[PDB]
Amino acid sequence: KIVNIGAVLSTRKHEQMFREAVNQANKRHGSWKIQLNATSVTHKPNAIQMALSVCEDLISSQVYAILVSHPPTPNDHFTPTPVSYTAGFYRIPVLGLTTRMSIYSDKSIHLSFLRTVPPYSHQSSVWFEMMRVYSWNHIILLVSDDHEGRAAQKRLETLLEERESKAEKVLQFDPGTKNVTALLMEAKELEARVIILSASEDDAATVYRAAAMLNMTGSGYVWLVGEREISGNALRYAPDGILGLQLINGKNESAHISDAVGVVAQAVHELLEKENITDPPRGCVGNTNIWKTGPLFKRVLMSSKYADGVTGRVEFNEDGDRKFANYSIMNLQNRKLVQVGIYNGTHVIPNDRKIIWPGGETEKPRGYQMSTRLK
Amino acid sequence: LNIAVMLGHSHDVTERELRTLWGPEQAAGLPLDVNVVALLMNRTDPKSLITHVCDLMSGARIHGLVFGDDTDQEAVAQMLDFISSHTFVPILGIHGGASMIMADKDPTSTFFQFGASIQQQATVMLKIMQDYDWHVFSLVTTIFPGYREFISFVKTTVDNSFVGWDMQNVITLDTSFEDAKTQVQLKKIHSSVILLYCSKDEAVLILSEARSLGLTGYDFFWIVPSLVSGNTELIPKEFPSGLISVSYDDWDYSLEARVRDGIGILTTAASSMLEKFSYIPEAKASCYGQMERPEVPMHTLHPFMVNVTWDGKDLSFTEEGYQVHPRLVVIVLNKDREWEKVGKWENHTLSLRHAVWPRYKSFSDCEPDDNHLSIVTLEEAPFVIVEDIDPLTETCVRNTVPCRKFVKINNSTNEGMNV
Amino acid sequence: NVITLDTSFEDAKTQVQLKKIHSSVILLYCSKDEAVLILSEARSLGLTGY
Amino acid sequence: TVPQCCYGFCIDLLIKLARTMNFTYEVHLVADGKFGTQERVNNSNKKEWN
Ligand SMILES: *[C@@H]1O[C@H](CO)[C@@H](O)[C@H](O)[C@H]1NC(C)=O
Ligand SMILES: *[C@@H]1O[C@H](CO)[C@@H](O)[C@H](O)[C@H]1NC(C)=O
Ligand SMILES: *[C@@H]1O[C@H](CO)[C@@H](O)[C@H](O)[C@H]1NC(C)=O
Ligand SMILES: *[C@@H]1O[C@H](CO)[C@@H](O)[C@H](O)[C@H]1NC(C)=O
Ligand SMILES: *[C@@H]1O[C@H](CO)[C@@H](O)[C@H](O)[C@H]1NC(C)=O
Ligand SMILES: *[C@@H]1O[C@H](CO)[C@@H](O)[C@H](O)[C@H]1NC(C)=O
């Protein structure tokens, strides 16, 4: 009953602090008798050597779960696709920490990928809650021609079908486009005056600059902006009146790991209490078979509940991602982010700070006017 | 300039190498001859695969890799995704583990596979329904990745269909092994044709539950997609017959036949590149390293592989990479639990059948029945005014039952199609 | 046609027998003890509708 | 798109509606010239209105 859980961490300091954390958690109840032997692989901007290190440090060991962290440099994307691709052979459940991309939401792309961070498409729930608590009926959607944007649009439509409403117009962007005047004018020539933005940081900054240049930052125009579209150059070239979103304690890698390692340690013994299991192959080449406990891991993990985590209960949805994540509605006041709304699960909690609006409005506007311009 | 083809232990290595050598030498000789490197290897392990890909890439800059397999693991295509993303080389999919396609094509990937997507089989299923004149739908699905968009697409297609099919609410299986809510979910199924957008393992249990509920009667019909019926030689005892399915198995094609089409597509792409550009493409300095920045100054091959025509066979591809004219032959489980080809779809994206559908006997249980009462009618008196049908993407006029009649072609030939 | 319950606690043929019931008014010629189980099975099959 | 001059019963009704319902309109003309039905275009399986 010797398990050797591997990990993929960023730097040596992380490799030491997280090893100390898992060593401490070994004796924090959970499993019984002996515990797991932990190991880590440093993050590398190269692929071949990183894959070889992963094979020589995890596959040779008795790995039942994989800890994958965010890239050390946030400027690059460096999606953790290869680790999930390798784990797909044996249905190895990897544990993403802050990978917020919507590519990993569906398990069709990655056979066995689990993360404690909600996908980008989960912002649709926050937007729907805000609309239902602020009495919004007509909404237009502006999403780029990306897989994450399409997933967000589909989620928004499916969640909006409950009220039997319908979006007015849907506008598409491009990964690198600069001239958005046509679509901006198309959005302007509409009854609704509320726009949802979900795209890359550079595209969001460019479209926001175009909107500011074309008088779209005035009174009566409420903007809904995602989490990743408020950082970078947005906080520098964006005036007040923007309702951003941020995850509470979502960026704390140490806090996420301190719960994920306990969850996987308890799940290992939960599976051990079940029938016999299948060990990973020793050599990276020499066994092309597939695990029989792969679906068992998903079955014992979807229904698992852990209230001992830092962020409270850690529940997994049908896609295996974080459920009821703690969101925080942001608001920009004099180029300073002010916390207004608190969203733990299916509930928004406004704060005593007044919700300002573009154009210096202290009251909630609406786009219910027809403008008497019926062609 | 160089083509690499990977095979397995299914056949002999020497004959495969000889056939791959003879491939480009059949017709349409390239201005720059391309060689073939066929290695008999069954090691589908990701590390072995990536090492072999690196060795081939270092092999005088191979500009084309053909990936074959003999197992049923889909992770080979998953590793091929990363391989194509980090190598930027066009790769063609052949029969094997990579036959099934379920992941969206990455923008940096150059994949053009022979498999058909779910949306590409929905039209075939709709044409089959048109041919069978079954206007009632019952979609029994399960919570799986990517199925919500498939359901939305099929709902939009049936809404945009001019026939006006009945579309009941889709009954999805929330949680497996409930044993309590399963009966409540199944109580809402009251139809004759049932669609199973599920997996093999859960579909076996779903059909077992239907048999326990007696949903495999004479009037009941089932349609099976390619993924569920992928393993033709794995027929569980709980599967009732009469499963009309669409697939592209090797019953009408071979690995050699598919690699011939692949090398033809490669030749067409090379000809297009030579027509447009005049510089031979080159790979990265390293085989799998990223010491330098990953950039591709040369234009991608996606625009050059759109109008792919080979000997009159339009092997074109869409923007995603899926085929436009796939195989998608029609198969159905026989009385003795065998699958036979009873239709094709290559003819201008149109579905034609063998005009044979007598499979009505109960398979899950043993209960004879007599429902289809054949009626003989002659058209000589003003009591039957049967005429032709209007070619408007619909069966015929409303509130009228369909029939059939033999049509004679020649005074000597007695063959008559069942129009 | 009348559908009778051959043997109690079959758990296999009960669903086959109940599958043929498609109506709004159902006659139950049984006893209390087995009628409780029959109605529980109907509830599991959702036969207690409006 | 030259400026024409159209009038009739429907336009008079539209004027009455505009006067009694706070409307300011600019009337256009149909480019196709038909009421609008189902036409056949590439991918004919899609119901597009003209
Ligand atoms: C954990 O496993 C690795 C790989 O097998 C090994 O090198 C290491 O020594 C093990 N840890 C301990 C404490 O022995
Ligand atoms: C953007 O496109 C519009 C066409 O709608 C054109 O009038 C405008 O000049 C373009 N702007 C730039 C900067 O290309
Ligand atoms: C925005 O509108 C105001 C008045 O409506 C005008 O003075 C100003 O010039 C406009 N902005 C731009 C960039 O033209
Ligand atoms: C993460 O959480 C721990 C525990 O509350 C805290 O000590 C630490 O400062 C947090 N990290 C950051 C970056 O706030
Ligand atoms: C989540 O927020 C709601 C606010 O409506 C509150 O009632 C609930 O107790 C909160 N739950 C947790 C676990 O904090
Ligand atoms: C609307 O119509 C009323 C007529 O009762 C008129 O007094 C008012 O000025 C109109 N308002 C506008 C904006 O046309």
Please choose, from the candidates A8, A5, A18, A3, the residue with its C-alpha nearest in 3D space to the C-alpha of residue A67: A8
Helices (runs of H) and strands (runs of E) counted in chain A: 10, 16
Q: Are strands B139-142 and B171-173 parallel, antiparallel or unpaired?
A: parallel
> Known binding site: residues of B?
11, 95, 233, 249
Distance CA D16, CA D31 (A): 26
Q: Which residue has the tokens 């074959």?
A: B68
Residue B355, C-beta contacts closer than 8 angstroms, at least 6 positions apart: B417, B418
- Residues on chain B touching C48 (C-beta within 8 angstroms): none
Helical residues (DSSP H) of A135-200, grouped into ranges: 147-160, 181-188
**B9 CB within 8 Å of a chain A CB:** no
Q: How far is CA B291 from CA A47, A49, A121, B80, B108, in A?
A: 10, 11, 34, 21, 19
Distance CA A47, CA A51 (A): 6
Residue B81 and residue A290: Cβ atoms within 8 Å? no
Q: Which residue has the tokens 């957008």?
A: B197
The SS3 call for residue A186 is helix
Residue D45 and residue B157: Cβ atoms within 8 Å? yes
Q: Measured in angstroms, how far is the CA atom of residue D22 from the centroid of ligand 6? A: 6
Question: From B163, which residue of chain D is nearest by alpha-carbon distance?
Answer: D45
- Residues on chain D touching B162 (C-beta within 8 angstroms): 38, 47
Ligand 2 atom 10, closest CA: A179
Two tokens, residue B337: 């639990």
**CA B385 to chain centroid:** 41
Is the CB of residue B217 less than 8 Å from the CB of residue B362?
yes
Is the CB of residue B103 less than 8 Å from the CB of residue A108?
yes
Q: How far apart are the first and last CA of chain A?
A: 75
The number of beta carbons lying within 10 Å of the beta carbon of residue B95 is: 21
Ligand 1 atom closest to A39 (CA): 1
Two tokens, residue A9: 């961490």
Please choose, from the candidates A77, A75, A110, A104, the residue with its C-alpha nearest in 3D space to the C-alpha of residue A91: A110
Question: From A319, which residue of chain B is nearest by alpha-carbon distance?
Answer: B145
Is the CB of residue B202 less than 8 Å from the CB of residue B171?
no
**CA A32 to chain centroid:** 33
Is the CB of residue B66 less than 8 Å from the CB of residue B3?
yes
- Residues on chain D touching A375 (C-beta within 8 angstroms): 25-26, 28
Q: Which of residues 204 through 223 in chain B touch C, CB cutoff 8 A?
A: 212-215
A140 forms bridges with which residues in the sheet? A195
Q: Give the long-range contacts of residues D40-46, CB within 8 A, separation 24 or more.
A: D44/B393, D45/B123, D45/B157, D45/B160, D45/B161, D45/B393, D46/B160
Helical residues (DSSP H) of B225-316, grouped into ranges: 255-276
Ligand 2 atom closest to A185 (CA): 5
State the chains in contact with C (3 or more Cβ–Cβ pairs under 8 Å): B
C17 forms bridges with which residues in the sheet? none
Distance CA A121, CA A136 (A): 20
Distance CA A228, CA A206 (A): 14
Residue A372 and residue D26: Cβ atoms within 8 Å? no
Distance CA B348, CA B325 (A): 7
Is the CB of residue B326 less than 8 Å from the CB of residue B345?
yes
Q: What share of chain B is helix, strand, coil (3-state, %, to 5)?
A: 25, 15, 60
The SS3 call for residue A187 is helix
Q: Which residue has the tokens 């999606």?
A: A79
Q: Measured in angstroms, how far is the CA atom of residue A61 from the centroid of ligand 1? A: 8
Distance CA B266, CA B64 (A): 8
> Known binding site for Zn(2+): residues of B?
11, 95, 233, 249
Distance CA B138, CA B185 (A): 13
Residue B164, C-beta contacts closer than 8 angstroms, at least 6 positions apart: B135, B394
Please choose, from the candidates A121, A70, A26, the residue with its C-alpha nearest in 3D space to the C-alpha of residue A252: A70
Distance CA B376, CA B357 (A): 18
Is the CB of residue A170 less than 8 Å from the CB of residue A141?
yes
Element (H, E) at B130: helix B118-132
Residue at C37: amino acid letter: L
**Can you give the resolution of this entry in Å?**
3.8
Distance CA B6, CA B48 (A): 12
Experimental method: cryo-EM
Distance CA A102, CA A149 (A): 8
DSSP string for residues in B178-242: -SSHHHHHHTT---SEEEEES-HHHHHHHHHHHHHTT--SSS-EEEE-TTTT--TT---TT--S-
**B205 CB within 8 Å of a chain A CB:** no
The number of beta carbons lying within 10 Å of the beta carbon of residue A147 is: 17
Two tokens, residue B212: 């326990």
Which member of B44, B82, B291 has the closest CB to residue A81? B82
Distance CA A171, CA A189 (A): 13
Is the CB of residue B349 less than 8 Å from the CB of residue B375?
no
Two tokens, residue B411: 């005074």
Is the CB of residue A168 less than 8 Å from the CB of residue A139?
yes
Query: ∠ at Cα B210 (B125, A303), nearest 5°?
Result: 95
Q: What is the dihedral of CA C5, C10, C16, C20, to 10 degrees?
A: 20
**Backbone angle region of B187, left / alpha / beta, with phi > 0 → left and psi within -120 to 50 → alpha:** alpha
The SS3 call for residue B314 is strand
DSSP string for residues in A207-262: HHHHHHHTT-SSTT-EEEE-STTSSTTHHHH--S-EE-EEETT-S-HHHHHHHHHH
